[PDB]
Amino acid sequence: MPFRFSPEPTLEDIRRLHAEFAAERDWEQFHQPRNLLLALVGEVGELAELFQWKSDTEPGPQAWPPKERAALQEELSDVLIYLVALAARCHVDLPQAVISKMDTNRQRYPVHLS
Amino acid sequence: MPFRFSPEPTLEDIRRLHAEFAAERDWEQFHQPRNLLLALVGEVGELAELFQWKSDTEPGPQAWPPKERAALQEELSDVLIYLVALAARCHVDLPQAVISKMDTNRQRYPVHLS
Amino acid sequence: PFRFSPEPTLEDIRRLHAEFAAERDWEQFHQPRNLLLALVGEVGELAELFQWKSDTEPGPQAWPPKERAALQEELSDVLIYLVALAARCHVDLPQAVISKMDTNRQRYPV
Amino acid sequence: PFRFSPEPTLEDIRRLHAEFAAERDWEQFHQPRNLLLALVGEVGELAELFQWKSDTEPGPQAWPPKERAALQEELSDVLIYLVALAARCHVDLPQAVISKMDTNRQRYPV
Numbered sequence: 001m002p003f004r005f006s007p008e009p010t011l012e013d014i015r016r017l018h019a020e021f022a023a024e025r026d027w028e029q030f031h032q033p034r035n036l037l038l039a040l041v042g043e044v045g046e047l048a049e050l051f052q053w054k055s056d057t058e059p060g061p062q063a064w065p066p067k068e069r070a071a072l073q074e075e076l077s078d079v080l081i082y083l084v085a086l087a088a089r090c091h092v093d094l095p096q097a098v099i100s101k102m103d104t105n106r107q108r109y110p111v112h113l114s
Numbered sequence: 115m116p117f118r119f120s121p122e123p124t125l126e127d128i129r130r131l132h133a134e135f136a137a138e139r140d141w142e143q144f145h146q147p148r149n150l151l152l153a154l155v156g157e158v159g160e161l162a163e164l165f166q167w168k169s170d171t172e173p174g175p176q177a178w179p180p181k182e183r184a185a186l187q188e189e190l191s192d193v194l195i196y197l198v199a200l201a202a203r204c205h206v207d208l209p210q211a212v213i214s215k216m217d218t219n220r221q222r223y224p225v226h227l228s
Numbered sequence: 229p230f231r232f233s234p235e236p237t238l239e240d241i242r243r244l245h246a247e248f249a250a251e252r253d254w255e256q257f258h259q260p261r262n263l264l265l266a267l268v269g270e271v272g273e274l275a276e277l278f279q280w281k282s283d284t285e286p287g288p289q290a291w292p293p294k295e296r297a298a299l300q301e302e303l304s305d306v307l308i309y310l311v312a313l314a315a316r317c318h319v320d321l322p323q324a325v326i327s328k329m330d331t332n333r334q335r336y337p338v
Numbered sequence: 339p340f341r342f343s344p345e346p347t348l349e350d351i352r353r354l355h356a357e358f359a360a361e362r363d364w365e366q367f368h369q370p371r372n373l374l375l376a377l378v379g380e381v382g383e384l385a386e387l388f389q390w391k392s393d394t395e396p397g398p399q400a401w402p403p404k405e406r407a408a409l410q411e412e413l414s415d416v417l418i419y420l421v422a423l424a425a426r427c428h429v430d431l432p433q434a435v436i437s438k439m440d441t442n443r444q445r446y447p448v
């Protein structure tokens with residue numbers, strides 16, 4: 001059956017939700033770009049830890065037990081939240097940056113040359 | 115002035131665009147979850163490299179020269195693209211996972227206790 | 229005056245980690261990609277110690293005992309898995325470093 | 339039979355990297371968070387070598403000369419910055435590893 005993401009939240013929605021979250025706790029002061037980047041690195045580490053002893057040939061994440069699927073959802077989400085916060089703190093329009101990068105990707109890797 | 119992301123593309127839009135990109139090049143075969151995760155780690159490295167010698171107290175990424183802003187947009191985008199691909203390859207509904215993680219974040223960090 | 233202790237050497241660490249793994253029948257888990265992902269995990273744990281540190285507050289030489297203990301452990305975890313990974317790949321890590329430092333001097337002349 | 343060379347030791351690497359940095363007046367750039375981010379960069383370069391490697395194709399012992407050269411360099415880059423970071427933090431990395439291995443034995447009894 002086709003796998004799709006839900007239509008919401010959008011990246012702007014996530015930015016907005018995280019900013020409201022941080023602002024309520026007076027955490028803006030901690031959200032300097034290098035702080036957010038190191039926090040991102042920490043969550044990428046937590047993501048890697050889930051996969052480190054999983055063989056490639058055995059069943060994949062669809063088959064993991066419920067607690068491990070929950071942990072996977074959480075870590076993928078933590079990476080995304082910090083990425084969004086970082087992009088916003090740097091005044092980068094992340095959705096449009098992705099459009100521009102995908103165009104660059106198509107030129108670097110034209111279909112006929114692969 | 116308020117900083118906002120553009121309303122599109124959405125995360126579903128990005129998933130769709132990346133899948134079409136990969137499928138055209140017969141790259142699905144390379145997109146196993148640990149491959150995508152290691153590729154993500156590589157792009158997080160490229161992102162870190164931009165910041166490694168930047169002092170925190172000096173002007174931030176808004177002030178970087180055009181070539182460095184371009185590189186920043188690209189690396190933030192490459193991290194996001196692989197994160198999206200990874201989440202999709204694991205059948206994780208990334209937007210809804212983020213909603214669930216933000217709820218968890220609010221319980222762990224109630225406003226009155228910070 | 230700050231120095232590292234003269235032992236263990238990287239070969240000593242290789243030997244100790246191999247014996248640790250072999251006793252537990254863990255060689256089967258220590259494939260290069262598994263060790264690399266484990267390394268990435270520990271790099272994350274290291275980053276976590278620094279992520280919220282302001283410029284004005286004390287630097288790691290001055291960190292309280294609990295935080296210095298955690299720092300020693302994470303720097304050590306990164307090193308142990310790096311050693312294991314290099315050994316699993318049959319890379320002579322000490323000599324590779326000498327070769328890399330020479331390359332670094334050419335890339336970065338004074 | 340696979341062994342690392344007996345030298346350089348971690349103290350030897352510390353010394354060599356400090357002299358490399360000091361000659362170029364780079365101490366000012368080698369603050370702990372800068373070194374940690376640089377380390378993360380090199381971990382990324384290491385990951386890139388493995389990212390598209392299938393299970394069936396040759397493992398790193400068997401990699402062609404160009405790829406083995408790249409592997410040696412990235413493992414070395416990770417180690418050099420890890421050493422620099424530990425030294426900048428006044429952490430006795432060799433002895434920290436001994437302490438961490440003891441902790442590992444208690445956490446993971448047979």
Ligand SMILES: Nc1ccn([C@H]2C[C@H](O)[C@@H](COP(=O)(O)NP(=O)(O)OP(=O)(O)O)O2)c(=O)n1
Pocket residue numbers: 018022027030074077078081082215219
């Ligand atoms: N200053 C902070 C601290 C947390 N957060 C948010 C962002 C993340 O989604 C999440 C990461 O913080 P966290 O304390 O590491 N919780 P996490 O669920 O990763 O559990 P552990 O790291 O304790 O295993 O809370 C934030 O936006 N700003």
Ligand SMILES: Nc1ccn([C@H]2C[C@H](O)[C@@H](COP(=O)(O)NP(=O)(O)OP(=O)(O)O)O2)c(=O)n1
Pocket residue numbers: 101105132136141144188191192195196
């Ligand atoms: N198998 C692949 C290879 C690339 N891609 C896409 C995803 C990324 O946005 C981007 C990353 O691949 P890339 O070759 O590293 N280009 P990048 O712009 O990062 O430049 P360099 O790493 O060469 O500096 O192309 C993909 O989806 N699947």
Ligand SMILES: Nc1ccn([C@H]2C[C@H](O)[C@@H](COP(=O)(O)NP(=O)(O)OP(=O)(O)O)O2)c(=O)n1
Pocket residue numbers: 254257273301304305308309438442
């Ligand atoms: N399968 C394993 C498990 C542990 N180890 C060793 C290597 C590391 O020095 C350390 C990493 O294992 P670990 O369980 O993640 N301990 P850690 O100190 O990082 O505490 P956590 O916070 O991760 O629970 O033990 C190993 O070499 N192979």
Ligand SMILES: Nc1ccn([C@H]2C[C@H](O)[C@@H](COP(=O)(O)NP(=O)(O)OP(=O)(O)O)O2)c(=O)n1
Pocket residue numbers: 328332364367383411414415418419
């Ligand atoms: N400011 C610096 C620059 C380089 N170095 C040393 C440490 C590393 O072993 C290595 C990293 O610098 P580098 O320019 O990233 N070289 P690298 O071999 O990784 O090639 P690139 O692919 O990154 O251009 O030189 C340093 O210690 N301090």
Ligand SMILES: [Mg+2]
Pocket residue numbers: 042043046078
């Ligand atoms: Mg966390």
Ligand SMILES: [Mg+2]
Pocket residue numbers: 043046074075078
């Ligand atoms: Mg987390």
Ligand SMILES: [Mg+2]
Pocket residue numbers: 156157160192
């Ligand atoms: Mg790249």
Ligand SMILES: [Mg+2]
Pocket residue numbers: 157160188189192
């Ligand atoms: Mg890139």
Ligand SMILES: [Mg+2]
Pocket residue numbers: 269270273
């Ligand atoms: Mg650990």
Ligand SMILES: [Mg+2]
Pocket residue numbers: 270273301302305
């Ligand atoms: Mg650890």
Ligand SMILES: [Mg+2]
Pocket residue numbers: 379380383
């Ligand atoms: Mg480099």
Ligand SMILES: [Mg+2]
Pocket residue numbers: 380383411412415
């Ligand atoms: Mg390198």
